[model samples]
Target chain A: MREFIPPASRFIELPDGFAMRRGGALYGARIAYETFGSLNAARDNAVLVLTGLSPDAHAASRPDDPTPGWWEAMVGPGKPVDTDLWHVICVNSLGSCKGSTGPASTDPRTGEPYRLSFPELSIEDIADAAAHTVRALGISRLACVVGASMGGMSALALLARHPELARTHISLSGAVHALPFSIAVRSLQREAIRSDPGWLQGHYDEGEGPRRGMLTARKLGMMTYRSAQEWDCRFGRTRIGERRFGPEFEVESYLDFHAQRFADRFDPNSYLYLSHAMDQFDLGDGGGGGGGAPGALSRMRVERALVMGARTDILFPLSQQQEIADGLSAGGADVSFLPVDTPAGHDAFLVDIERFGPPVAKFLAIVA
Target chain B: MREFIPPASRFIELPDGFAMRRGGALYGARIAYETFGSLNAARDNAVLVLTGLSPDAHAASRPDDPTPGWWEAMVGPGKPVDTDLWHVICVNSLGSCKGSTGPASTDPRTGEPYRLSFPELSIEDIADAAAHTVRALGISRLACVVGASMGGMSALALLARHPELARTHISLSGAVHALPFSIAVRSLQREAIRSDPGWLQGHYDEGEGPRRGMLTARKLGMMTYRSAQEWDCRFGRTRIGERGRFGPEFEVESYLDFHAQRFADRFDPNSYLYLSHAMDQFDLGDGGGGGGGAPGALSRMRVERALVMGARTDILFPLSQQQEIADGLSAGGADVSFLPVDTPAGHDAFLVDIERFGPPVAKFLAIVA
Candidate 1:
């Protein structure tokens, strides 16, 4: 019921009766996006950026939006992706609540937010929407597709389904599909939300849906985003000296601070749909003609790829990145499988940009 | 507001006006326990068994109770602890609802269940009550003290305070103090229970206290009790093919549901909150003499010999903790050995992987005998 749209966001209307990957369709729907730098007359300097579960189209600051964006450190004029050189277009995912048409968006027929009546979301739907946005902008082939975290899955869907959408790829902490452990974590998060009486089957008030359940779910998410070793070094048994049933230790306080912030900004129904979509995402499921994950990867036609994953990413470990690298290599693409060693874990791509940026800048410099 | 006392449990009254470590005193309070085998004439063959959070005095079944016990595989006639050769006395933890006086017990002063009114429970208090039980049974010095999980912390408290209660010790998957990660996990579990509307601030009806919260807490507990590697092999991406959102879709989800449902039906929510908080509060170094931290408190133990064992896969209490215990005991001149067992069962390996845990326990007990 809440959406945080940046002032710089621009919307492109989709074709009437836009069909979902699962069994439903949307009318008068649109995709939200933002761009940095400008396309040259050759129109090949474009880099399409797809985001993770909770990012907005406003990935960087601009004149219209003076506030720092989620990837502010890595996507500015002189930053790693280098708006001075390559044109960057970051898309707010099709199923997100950030200025894009999602569960929180109004249904044209009933004139209310879709809520559970929204079509079942899939990573494919997100991919197709981004592809439509790219072609709608008159760009036949993007120079590169930069995907990080869940965006890595989205990026793969984009490359696999739309063969000419991008010529090269950069995947950060991405996987072909979710591991069972990740599935369990996400399942518990959804259960936490649904268990809250305030949820009211996703029909609660716009600003008051399951605050406690959302808080708990976000706390669990925070625990996995960072490594245990990072917490040990940062707040080892440090107490706030209070004796209460909730949040006594410094680590618990840290989770509370961050989780509260996240719960305030995110939509509960959008979170449920997006998290379930990640669990249901299988590259081989519908598009690979009976090919498993590796086969689906082999079918991607990108010419060059940079696959990077954090060694400590328990959510999407190095094994999954290596699999993507090996699969792309099998498909005859020049693949660089870089395994980053950082204690920041799954969120290292966002936190340890010094380590992540230079390699991306180096890869982009060499892209023809 | 409930207790899972076994039919065969026996109670021994503490001295009048027995005091708690943190605050208040209990009048005419009792410790519940069960015994295996007969004590020797010198009473030197007695081995005291202390439990983790949930177990009762029924470590192993006998004629009086025909049901299998929590540690049944390792405590029979010829099993690891070998009840036939060692007179074993297992005491339900002091703050546990399993046949023990805890938050769920009725306060004689007001004739109502203690609930939140129960005095703050500490691992040291549990250790003290356990020592009192041993003394009441006429045992001057025990042959050995066997502790597993939380019991290991209690055993350390006993050895640190009483000094002469036991001459030998065996610690399985225990920590002197919980790590920050463990604290966060337990804190979240407690939060889940406290957030439950049915909890009613720990005053719900006898059988219906925070069932949903208890179920969530137990599921999270199940996730940490076992290793991810075990789940990878056992469940992998195998789905139940369910379509409902938030329902059990994978085998691992189903497994957690089955186990957590059973636990939620039995455990007392207040007792769980009290005992879990006790673990977070336990720091062997607190107020202890030698230096500080676990190594300092451990160095003060008078135990003549010790064995510390842990699973390499244990995320809750890592193998590094076991090494700390062994090193500390060795510093105190005790003959100590550390065994880091290889098993994918994680924290629960000591309970489930008997083949890996049994031999070390039996060998150490045999040497102590």
Candidate 2:
């Protein structure tokens, strides 16, 4: 039930009886978004920025609420996204607890939080919601749609369904579907949460359910988000304490510090729903009646596409980025498959922004 | 408190007040071991087999204990070690619960299972216990010391301390010290067990201690014990049923469940915690008055020859680690041969992918014999 909304957040209401991609309908659903800079008279300079599993709409700081954002280094005036040139709209994905309607949100009919009662959330449903947000903003054709991580999958879906919505795309470390390794990792994380007695079948009171489980799950996520080579260099066997069964090493303490910070900020149910959606996502599921991932990507009408991945990102590997590039190229989008030579792994787009920023800026400069 | 000892298990009592490495002692404590083949009159034909974290001394079956051992394929007659030519002694590590004196073993003074009351276990202590058993068996020097995984670390510790205890060495997927990545993984596994309400600070009732936590810990272990590439080849993205979230959907998920269940039911949670912690605490650098790390500690080992092998897909102990051992032992004046076997079974390749591991091992043992 933890939904930390930023002060500068703005909302766009979905049309009444908004049907979800899977099979449910929401009466009064709204998406949380934040805008940067001014829209041009042609309304074609709009760039829709979708996020990964955890971020809010606050991709970068607005003057209204001046806090540095998740991608502050890559977005803003004169930054990579360059607020001075493009009108950027970043939306917290539909099922995120950050600011959007998710399992943590109150249901209108039952007057209770959705919790497990929330319908099965798919990545397609998340894309449809972002498309709804774009149309609600009165922007017919976007200059480009920039998606990072999970957002990359959403961007592909958005372009696949609404072919003429965006002219180009920038996919950062996103994949069409979860590989078995990634699914196993996510499955273990979910199991860690569910096995905690405090979880109480996702029905515990606010600030109570599975906090320890969340901590363990977050630790596991941190392990996968970074590479073993990175940890080898960063914290190599450096003991911080003599205590057993606790954070005795520098790496253990580092995971503890980060996991503790996150365990309470995000809701467990929302995490499970979003993680499951990513696993179930298949871009070619029913595309144009029968082409797999490449067939689905071939249908996208984007003029150009940028597919970027970190060399050390084992979670959403560089190979997957190449696949995205190939898929988009099949659709006749001029594809630039830029591999970021960074050791930060999948979180490189956020932390190793210096390497990620230049190419992102270069891509957006030629977005016309 | 869960000691799943085999019926044919045999024990040798340590001298009174067997001192541990880290300030504690065990009195009337014994080590469990099993022998295959016959000890020759020369006694120089003996090969001591030290084990990984979970295995007992029953490495291979004998007439008394006909059941298959954890290393059934690699140990008995005409196998890699070839029991017909070499007398092989496999000792259950000191901190393990499979018939060895461990946290699950009874405390002589308190008349109860030691549990956390047991002395802080270290890789060095396990090595010392194995050495004691070797001496008790009247073997002045082993023809070869063969160690696998954690046993590899123990074998190194034994070789380093008792310089003349073994003439030759064979290390399989072992390391001088665990890297930070491995430490983090083992630490998380320990935390999972400790956090369980059933654990009760290492003092839960027998047969019912941190079962879920142990299951989770073992699942994590299975993930590292095998490679992702192996899983991709075996169980891709295939789903088993429609109901997915939080339940077993992927074939890999069910596979993990089966393995974890078998392990959690058999292993004592405290013994697992202690032994897993000992693996992390093992650092070759800390020996012979510190400062030199693995290189310094290895320089003191006195084995004449060594064979080091690691699977290419072993994330736990990568191939480079075995090379480290090979190079270090070579520096210590041993004729060293290094083999990096390419197998997708990862850390468990020594056990399962023996077709690739066996030839080299058999050849090495032949050379030693």
Candidate 3:
């Protein structure tokens, strides 16, 4: 594997009237993405990376930015999704606040942030946008497509919507349909943002808006991402100091630090759009309400697929990954299911790379 | 066993300078309670009932209120607590808003709501208040002290502080000390209330404080009280209508809304904060904090007991705590019977799976009688 600088982040204009899953269309929408390693002569070595709720298109270090990325731990020279051998394409989903055209992006017709005017987004629109980006890149086919968690669902959506783009697929900790627990957690997160007086019903000005509720919601989310066993052993009831409203436990402090940082960077309206989009996602007629997972899954025709799940993941349990494998298998897609044991819970894919890395690397090697 | 009427709710004030574990003293703090059936001639027929986070002194129905109680299935005349054989004394804890001296209660100092002015409260103070109520009623000892969840902690506090108060104990879904998960959940609940702009630093007047945050916090609580299996089985992925932003979908969301509404309707915001704080503060220490090695403190009190828990409870307390109590009881004298039921009801097992609780409860009640 040769070590080389990666390409800078870029964007591709979506064809006018880019329709959303739930109806409505974008006028002059653009998709943001970052790619690493060079496209080989065959143009078939491209690997598309789909991210979860929080990350941007910055999947790994690039020539312009040597700084780390959300998945920099896994996508560098000789890392798991080895960028040395594959041209990795990472796209910030359409409804995110990253360097992407989202709610924070200016509406070309109105010359102001989309805010509440952005069409109701869904995971399928995100997949469709990524597929459009693939076509814009002049690639007739991708060697492989990989996604994690929400990204995992997007990959499944991609497989169904653009079966000719890739012959192989990899899904990590996702499901055929959004379960009750997933919906409930996300619903509360949205509630937290709306409950904030600063939210102004998703119309708050830039650099302001529901930061407090976003902070607390992120803290709440931080709890769900990891296991109680991990918290029990790692941070327990250890107090930080004599403080206001009583001393904070170590775990609370950890939440405060990370959540505040996240709140500072992310837009509340984008959070609302993306979080709600996930709940609205139905891979089953992409759960747009009718097709359901089994019927929706039958629409894909991939040669092979790899599904993986964390042992401690509760939000998207191993059962969900199992269902994906089972559904794909039943639909004539060759399937490989690997259960990674870790105490990181729903965030295991991001944190417990030791247990999660090998299986992903081996699968990408065979597929790419 | 015969059915009879339970008495109306009553209040009894404590002596001046009722010291609390979290410091400060109350002049005329009090407890509210209700009694069921008749106390026998021996006075040994008395049973003290400590409550969980939400209940008032009314555990069951009375002649005045035909409406059912929170534990309507388990605490009536012919039910497991068996008012026929034992006179039940159910007391609202010290920091509660239901006819008890709490954050919502009048401060004798200035004749205004205590609010945050009330001294820091502990689960031990709630237990001690119940013990004082027991004394005020002219009873020297009790037949049993029963509680579940937060009430379980109070019952244990009663046993630890006043050893001779009861001969037997019943605990359901409680722990010796608040675990990381327990405290974290509660701290977030309090954070939710405090975060609300309407909170106004705990100075909000009647019907004027942080209802939105309280409502959301309550919904969070409802989720933890039950298991995922229950939600999966009951609600699954069912959606209610074409989804709207402010509107809800799924059986779980509707359930959370109803539950939060019910909580916000009755519980005073300040009282909710104090009671949840006390739950987090409990340390199985008997409030004897200066002592060495807190683990050794478990040995001081262990009544002949049936340590009970659900197979699925995670939030209110873990069954792992139940296994600990069972071991502690067995070590003390070895008559401890740890009963575990397989149910998806989780922490609300006692409320949801009454049939599963009856057999062991009946045997225990028989022996206590």
Candidate 4:
């Protein structure tokens, strides 16, 4: 049994009567989250940092694990998020295996892993999970809520679902509707995992596990994450050896390394569930009483927002980010759009430190 | 048996029983060649246009074909070669499928297809073959021999193997030795065929034959033959939905279609084998026997040569061509240099339009003086 710690982070025990957006009921679902710095007297210094696809409650900065979180460089003592001044909280998203109530977590009904029986989760459910965690932490109004990629979609849901909770919103490299290309890519990745012989229909814990399928899925993800132009320019027709025994190009080695590293630690089922959830993250679906109209749902938001995106980000291009900015601006909110120019492509927002650091710092200051 | 028809133009044939370059004998190996218009009385108005890897015996304007020979635009009545004045003869080299003895031809010893057992050829042998054909055609010498790609290689070999064959040579996108990168690329294409289950070690003789392997080989070739930048600019990530359950990417389909059309009719596998043999034509082992000590073979050419290369030709860039030209010129006593030209045609100079290539052609001709 994984014990829960209070304040700093803990797993919450949902009431037996609790229900999800997907009509699935949870008797005692456990939710996990982490908080940094201290909330001011007004309880308004708290900033929520919603994480993207694969992350945990360890956002902003952590004292126990001094390694800092994923966006630690941007949220340290003097960093952009400025933990010294603002109390930031990051929650492990629902349906994710990282310290959250996900498929890997025990099912209260059968006392076994939920496996494929875990109820289909929506992006709103994830946002709601974060809200519950934030409320438990004694936070009322938030100064700002920042999210990136899938986290950005969750941030949108937060603004729409709980309008008065956060004053400022920031969404990066995300959109309201899932693009068809993204859906197709995610579909192929899912097929790669499910079609593996070792997968055994997602019940392969007894065997060597679906290592091959998981690795294949990771490789596919890596291909989508990076740009083809970068690959060609860096490793075109270059041979590693006289014979075909070694990596032919630097790109191949990079992809192989990424796949192997991911498969070594990532939970396959959690990946499948979360990826499906991301694919199903269209707020315009009009389900769950989300205003039941296109553009109307987004228009309900009143918070001033700043949208940022990388120019070379093909995975989540600047155009998609611009669409979000356009929507908010059209909805009569104070909106500012910033498109960062960098050659590193989608990964530039993460890798090109110098290019993103200044603009991000400026945006955070402006929001503050 | 495929029969050869005497071209309805001035032509040439090499002597019978000529000794081949490799460790073998060519009993009746003859080169069929054709010349457009009349030769000058002084015979000084002769220019030799070398055909590419495939085309032979039809390097000049042909009235019957009407489609114009490979170099027809460059060597016509009023073209750069000026057939009306200069005597232009295009010879079909030895060991080529075009009116020449190749792998598909009889072995003479056993009267069967030579196939893989065919004698290993060299660029020197190709040059020697052309020389014989020129001699048989009653031409003593040439003012200039213009070659492109593999033909460009033959031009260099002509300067080295048969000195005095041509006073001046123009090599376009040619290489002295096949670089390791080129060898690797060519090896991949060969592997694509050899790995095919139906290939059966190149013995697959069925209805459609090894068309799939050949098609794959061509697609691979197309990738290297053009610039990736060009492809992206022209057809970035565009999908041409599965060609009736084939695959996406219209560029890939276009590549396959073009290759199929050519391979099905014009190209023969046996000739590809012979051409591969010809490309491995360096006397590196014996240290380039003709000029000096075994070590200085590459740097020992005694003929005026001008090297022309394309910028986007990543496979065979002008830099590589220039280095070979300079090295050959520095070895002995011959004035040789390079001229870099920009073209989107990649390694297809011989097939490119004459207008775009006219400047270099004219410059090289003037330098031959």
Candidate 5:
């Protein structure tokens, strides 16, 4: 059981009147971030590792945190991320709760929590916050910007909206547009959370809040996170107990454990916000012209890219990763597509550290 | 849209103190049924085609009716069943409302609809009623007793309990024990119907019944009835209307439409009670260990021969049918097995009209030919 330690990251102020692409403007937005390794004099030895749905600023190892960070094995000394050589920066994006301004954070006007009243966040907003953090650090222009899953979408947003921010981009298990099936599944999860009576329309901070609904949402999410084959193989018609009140099967116990674990640390409101952000993350570049400004965005040139996906990933399948690769190539970026083989399905990239780390290491090394 | 016609059938009366093997005794039990084609002087030309979950005596063509019946494709002259050569007897089981006494039937004692007060009828009761129907038609031995889906289960029950009833048994998409998954799916459908406020706990009349819940139940049933591939091929992501209120992309809609439409007109609520009665017809041969003696006053005998069939498209009633056939046959002291087929019309064995079904049909018929 690894404990997650809140990172001792500092905030950097953004320029006033920073207009977002989605018609909104932020005045004094701040970014919370943690950095590893020393910056070179030329500032060319930097690597930005973007955090995904649930993670914060702590991407790798931390002194105060006894447990290594989420991507610990991939970012240590001489490892794939190579903290010994390249300076790695992980930022807690805007609309997040890890020392960053979010729904839980007090509003400047009312000095109260935004709750459901928080501004609807898009991927571009997260990218803007990441860019502001990097600019405040006073280093840019050589190393790649690597992101996985939702983080990958943010990285693409950075390249599309702020091309001069990074030299190369690495996207893993990411999609250009959210598939309808995925949207349906996410909607069910969101509904499970919102429909709880205790939720009180997202203003129940004074009470116990919607823990049951949050648990139900987590259980639904866990179903989508793993493959049916995995559950069948792991539990498979085996009874857990004889008593009626007792657990019936190992699968039920596994789901209960997952739900409990999610309810412990994760905020239901933050989960809703991040899920919505993922749903809204559509690159303006359309690969086959279903929507968005495809023609204009595809003509924009990207430097270099690496697109990767896990074979059994049902949530974001290899097909989606291929679509991203195709789109990037169409945009005139030098791109390589790779499929990571693992049985863990969508969570394979996070669990199969050794297998996934090598590709990231090779791609970053080649580009560097 | 095919129209189903009811048959004008005769009734058979049972003697007093007659008991069922399933721990229930009855007096003055009677059965109603219709016969098609002609029985030979030897009485060995009879082919019994048992009705499915909600079907009745109208299993074959009805003389006075304009439309054909459920097994009309197989039971007519020169058809697969070949009623021209074999006499086909289709009966409405004991606890049914087509022509027999059931939940909707007038109770001789009370002179009112049985409703929830109907006596708990088991599969043995229906089988007994079927046996009486066979005897009343002057048939001592059947050449073959063939059934599909729920009818297959009744066929096995007949064979297991009455050894001398039939020489050959053919079961299609039948099973010995309903699997947990099947039971769960059925439970969901039952819940859907039971949960409907309009059901009023099964007290509603015929015309004012729970149509919405029944439709929803049919929709749920449609999912398990057909293959996912078939659904994708037929209604792939296509919306029906501007509001998307009704569409074929659900696949369940197409399935429910086929069932609910037929069910709305032909199926009676009382018949549903008896059909469920036949489902709980499973005996497991003295708790499946074969130790208990026959409940007093009930005739019990082991069947001597059997054959089973299944369809690939039939996911709801899969290979479990064959497994049930084997078990029931073994319990009846017979050498029995299954020849599972690959068809696409699900539990509709008489339909789908698969090309390969002919060879097996001919082969199985040859044993009793």
Candidate 6:
């Protein structure tokens, strides 16, 4: 613990071989991760951070490059998951295209990108990989595991499968299961991407296949990710762009901006895989293997758990968080359910840091 | 009125010729209208009914054919409309493909299908055609003008441009103008059609053009036309069908297919293009290109009876727009009955849920009766 200089990013190689939740294996499966702060002498100060579908291993600012990370405000020295006291490990999710081994990653067998050949992803695989990463870092136990959105799903999965790794859990805008509405939305998005002839049945050209479809899918995703009230207040038909007609409405341009930014960086196949994984995810199924959401929560050795949800989030609504709290409580696990009333919707945890910060920090203190 | 021999479907020719809203003239323009019950002695019992985007003149059961019409439950003898009392004149809209002059019609001058070469359609044009039909029938003033959705737009246009033509107005799920959300939805729908190579720049022949594009557009539209809650309650991921993938798992998916099929079967591709364009062009602030702004135009109407409504669940033309119509009617010193229907059928609530809609409409008619 004395030689604790952290690198910008590091890959934890799984020489023991990585077996995915959904019946597949990558021989040299490694996880890309970043660490902030130094581990305590007793190695009892580490916190595992899981992310949503998008964000990378960079959870906060690096010391040399003080630019903020995606969860910019919450992970600084004196922030919510305070780096001053605790070592934080944030890894890129297993099936994410960003700095993670996903569908876009080269396959060891064919020496080609995995593409559709990548094993069907499950939320548990992300949890398993992060757990493996935690173990590889020589930390047999940690204070708590904090997850947001998809990260919350992973945290629950980890708690279900390897509960001994983390003493407690924190889930924000998390779900015990993907609702049918969410499944319907994602199914349409996938349809949009697949329907495009350019998708070429997932054998698209170098970064060019199904850009229209991907952009459309992303635009639709953004609509669901945020509340209709947010769009009404923020955009509300303000005109933008110049074209054949009088120009696109402001919401169209807003969606366009997000879609272009996302499509420019994300791999379509990876998006398809991750999105499908989200649709396939049900906490009850325990990575589609055994235990259920309530079943798994009860089986886990978590001392206490914190579940938070956004009031306006339609994707992972507050009701889902209520279920998580209810289920965990039913299991006789010490649990707290916090609802953040916001117009920002499911992305509240990401944007309404002020509202989320104090509560999360307080929970971390108590859980520790 | 003595010479009148009422027909189920009749075409009234605008003898002096018909002038279009967007710069065009039909030398022998005529409108197709279906009537329920008789016009009667004074012809004062007449009620003109306009349609949404796709409905034709067939509105209710006629004597020759007991086969019910689109608004079957609402327009029959003892129904809300009370056809036993009021003679209903439901006209197929001018730009519509059903039994009306539209893109599918043979051009008078060139003797070929007008296709995309027809006059740019406007809501005002449909109103103008209806007004002409009334005038051609020698009915200087009618009892009331009822419209729903696109029909509501035309009803306002008719009320705006020809205030002397009707005594009262009934508007349902209508808007003063297409909102940004509606515009965005339609824009995407249009893009779907245009992007499909089969659309062929609106030149595709009958039953031949861009079927997939139309289906996809209709599918998207079906999603917006109803509420997510409605879908959740009704469909709730009941998996059905089989394909290369998991197939339609939600009843909502099944609904999308039904709507797409209905739209594809009843509409002409070119007519759909023209009608959609017309809707996008409607502006309450616009002079109707002649009759003054909507406020001033609405003010000119001397009718004291007005009924304006919107379904609470309608997304395309929201209740806010219905409120606009109510407020405008109030400004014109008219007593308006406005109700936001709770049915989750959206714009289609006017056609689909007769039980919820009939009472208010029945009361409105009885008040006018």
Q: If you superpose only chain B onto the true chain B, what TM-score does each candidate give? A: 0.97, 0.97, 0.93, 0.84, 0.83, 0.92
lDDT of 6 by residue, A133-210 (tens): 999999999788988898888888888888779887888998866765677677767767776778777788685678
In model 2, the runs with Cα more than 4 Å from the true position are A241-244, B241-245
Per-residue error (Å), model 6, residue A60: 3.6
Off by over 4 Å in 1: A241-244, B241-245
CA error at residue A169 for candidate 1, angstroms: 1.4
Error of 2 at A234 (Å): 0.6
What's the lDDT for residue A34 in model 1? Answer: 98
Q: How high is the CA lDDT of each candidate model?
A: 0.87, 0.87, 0.80, 0.64, 0.65, 0.78
**Pairs of residues clashing in candidate 5:** B174-B321, B175-B321, B176-B324
| Candidate 3 CAPRI level | medium
What lDDT would candidate 6 get against the real structure? 0.78
> Tens-digit lDDT track for model 3 on B327-350?
665655736778887777888788
Candidate 5 stretches with Cα past 4 Å from truth are A1-7, A14-29, A241-247, A285-301, B1-369
DockQ leaderboard ranking: 2, 1, 3, 6, 5, 4
**lDDT of candidate 2 over A96-209, digit per residue (tens):** 887888888888889988888888888888888999899999999999999888888888888888887998899999988777777888888998888888887888787667
By descending lDDT, how would the candidates be arranged? 1, 2, 3, 6, 5, 4
Runs in model 3 with CA error above 4 Å?
Answer: A1-7, A241-247, A286-291, B1-7, B241-244, B286-294
Q: What C-alpha lDDT, on a 0 to 100 scale, does residue A339 get in candidate 5?
A: 86
TM-score of 2: 0.96
**A1-368: candidate 4 lDDT, tens digit per residue:** 22122235656665565567877866678677776777888887888988888767776546666655667667678877788778888877888777778777778789987877778778888888887777777777788888888888888887777777888887777777555445444544564566455666656674346666676566656555555434444554444433411234344455556777766665667778788777667666544544533374455565678788877565576777897887778778788898887767656655666766776677668766
Question: What level of docking quality does candidate 6 show?
Answer: acceptable
Best by DockQ: 2
TM-score of 6: 0.87
Q: Fnat of each prediction? A: 0.47, 0.59, 0.56, 0.00, 0.00, 0.15
Model 1 docking category: medium
RMSD for each model, in Å, please? 1.8, 1.9, 4.2, 10.3, 8.8, 5.4
